[PDB]
Design a protein around this ligand. Structure first.
Ligand SMILES: Cc1cc2nc3c(=O)[nH]c(=O)nc-3n(C[C@H](O)[C@H](O)[C@H](O)COP(=O)(O)O)c2cc1C
Ligand SMILES: Cc1cc2nc3c(=O)[nH]c(=O)nc-3n(C[C@H](O)[C@H](O)[C@H](O)COP(=O)(O)O)c2cc1C
Lengths: 368, 368
């Protein structure tokens, strides 16, 4: 019923935008539009991308810099570059090796794998791809407390070193592409099957989101943190008040995100929200930033604006479609090399120097 | 020929402003004006004080807070409240127990003592007051590198766990009170018995800042940062570019200060400089803030604006000025209790919560 790409190969990445059109040629139409699409007419996905032009980098000269070092550390994980893999459902829509292929790319590159609760691969299949590499587990909460305890226990037993509480998808965004394509998952989700009584095959993402917890409160952040004894990130924050609340409720990290514009429509581009959240967090917990990172310049601008790392999403999945783990790896390698150039030209010898950059305010925005 | 007060007692501190007028009816005019005075007509000392009215606290209701905890940690020192003692020369101008008295107050209260290179007490006298309490050593950059090696070794032998490189004093401020009083130190500086070649008493104030390094460079920051084997704070920073330079040169901390307005005249109030510096530092190293902290509200505002801790100066010395005397352990206890009240009224359970406060921008400034 669904013929995902299966080829494994490295790819020469000139830029990540060209990956979308290239992946559209190999991924079945429904699955491709599920990955690529966003809410409404995609104005907020375009805002995620255009937001990068609001704050511009300065080249700096005679900075006494050579061979920049992209390495960093988050929550006692040394990682090769200040980016991690975002939790994304259903990698089998992009490639037959699915989450095992993404996990292999992430572990081979040397950063953190985020596992979606809506993975099409089992923990065992992902663990094989990770080969001991670090992993964080993203929970889409069951309504039943005991199922959450069981899901958290499974993830920590698999070796999770943080929990990502995604709270921005209590209902689906208005994803017009998936509505027009009448898109359903063509395979099961082994980690959350328990609270879908039946199977996730042939279900819409409405009824799967529907089966998850709508009435998430701060108590949920407390209780995940107490049960897991792991640091909890709260993912989907765009308003600084939610960051303050999440920290006061026991979060160990803030994950600034609008879900790649797949949720609330006619909202700001995610990067525009970051400085106000970073100023409110004021160093209390680490910040992960995502939603629209496409270039090394974007990684640099996020760090300059208060993020400790960024999370990568669609570009990595498009690489997986085009080359399996080697194609996904190629995208991670592109971001690392792209950032190294940006570090050299900005006078940045290391990731801490990036955090110290001043940005040029562009009040004209995209058209200039 | 200097009759400092010698009485030891607790004092009922209603506010720290009243401590300045209290003291001078045995408490010598010249030394009082050395402690209290500032550059020019003291407009920038007034600016340090009025800057607190630029950013106002909001009371925050039904915040689920009681028994706030003022404890915090800096460079792995757990301290009772988020304030430390600033490095101040010549405590014997305020009281016969001099730096040993201050050290005993600081150690008994449970925070960090900063030792001025221009202490009138030997390290062994201060050590007796400290009774194993944590201490940081404040240096000036010597022209003679042997003198930099010598004082860094003295620091480490004396159990310092950080070095404070004061940079903002390569020459003296235009301190009109000391000029009009023809003020001379009435005692020696035993710690820096190695620089002044001739006599310490014979050198008034302009010759002592002259015997030290005028030509401080980043390499000075780097060299202290290398010989010390201790974290180095660079003290006197008011411009964000200096904070970025200092960190790139190996500083382990930024100490935002204008030296209590005793140095450059017709400069901003210190608190007005803090947010630009905190934004540029962007979590890379801890920030100590000083110059004008008089109230618990000031400690809260500094933390809300990016400082990890504040340093206290003149109010702790107030064993000296204008009337009948007051300043010590009672002053540290005042600041702790005052901060606890502010925490309760702002909805802050702990020092991290203070770092998340939003402040009201007052564009009308002091006269409102
Ligand atoms: C196909 C797809 C599926 C996603 N599924 C999840 C999910 O299972 N869990 C989650 O927390 N976020 C999910 N997200 C959001 C991502 O974690 C991330 O926020 C987003 O991909 C970032 O935007 P970008 O990829 O355009 O840069 C998904 C995003 C995509 C594109
Ligand atoms: C009497 C006096 C002497 C000082 N001596 C020194 C010094 O030896 N070393 C130094 O780094 N700063 C010195 N300072 C500056 C203090 O460390 C601190 O920045 C200042 O007291 C803070 O301002 P405030 O006390 O008005 O709040 C001195 C300040 C005063 C009032």
């Amino acid at each position: 019923e669904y013929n995902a790409p299966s080829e494994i190969k490295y790819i020469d990445v000139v830029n990540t935008y060209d990956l979308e059109e290239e992946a559209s040629k190999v991924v079945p139409h429904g699955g491709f539009n599920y990955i690529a699409g966003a809410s409404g007419d995609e104005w907020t996905k375009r805002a995620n991308d255009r937001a990068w032009k609001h704050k511009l980098l300065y080249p700096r000269l005679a900075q006494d810099v050579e061979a920049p070092d992209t390495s960093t550390e988050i929550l006692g994980h040394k990682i090769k570059a200040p980016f991690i893999m975002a939790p994304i459902a259903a990698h089998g829509l992009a490639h037959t090796t699915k989450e095992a292929g993404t996990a292999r790319a992430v572990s081979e590159f040397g950063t953190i794998m985020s596992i979606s609760a809506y993975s099409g691969a089992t923990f065992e299949e992902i663990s094989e791809g990770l080969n001991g590499g670090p992993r964080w587990f993203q929970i889409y909460m069951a309504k039943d407390d005991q199922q959450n305890r069981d899901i958290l226990d499974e993830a920590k037993s698999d070796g999770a070193t943080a929990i990502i509480l995604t709270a921005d998808s209590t209902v689906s965004g208005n994803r017009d592409r998936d509505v027009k394509n009448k898109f359903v998952y063509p395979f099961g989700m082994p980690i959350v099957q328990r609270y879908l009584r039946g199977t996730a095959e042939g279900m819409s993402l409405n009824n799967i989101y529907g089966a998850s917890k709508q009435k998430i409160s701060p108590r949920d952040i407390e209780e995940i943190a107490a049960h897991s004894g792991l640091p909890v990130f709260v993912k989907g924050i765009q308003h600084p008040e939610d960051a303050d609340m999440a920290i006061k409720r026991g979060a160990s990290g803030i994950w600034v995100s609008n879900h790649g514009a797949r949720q609330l429509y006619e909202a700001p581009g995610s990067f525009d929200t970051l400085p106000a959240i970073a100023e409110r967090v004021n160093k209390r917990v680490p910040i992960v930033f995502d939603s629209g990172v496409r270039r090394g310049e974007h990684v640099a601008k996020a760090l300059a604006s208060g993020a400790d790392v960024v999370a990568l999403g669609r570009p990595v999945l498009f690489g997986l479609a085009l080359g399996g783990w080697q194609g996904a790896y190629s995208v991670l390698d592109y971001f690392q090399k792209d950032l190294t150039r940006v570090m050299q030209l900005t006078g940045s010898q290391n990731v801490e120097d990036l955090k110290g950059l001043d940005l040029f305010d562009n009040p004209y925005g995209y058209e200039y």
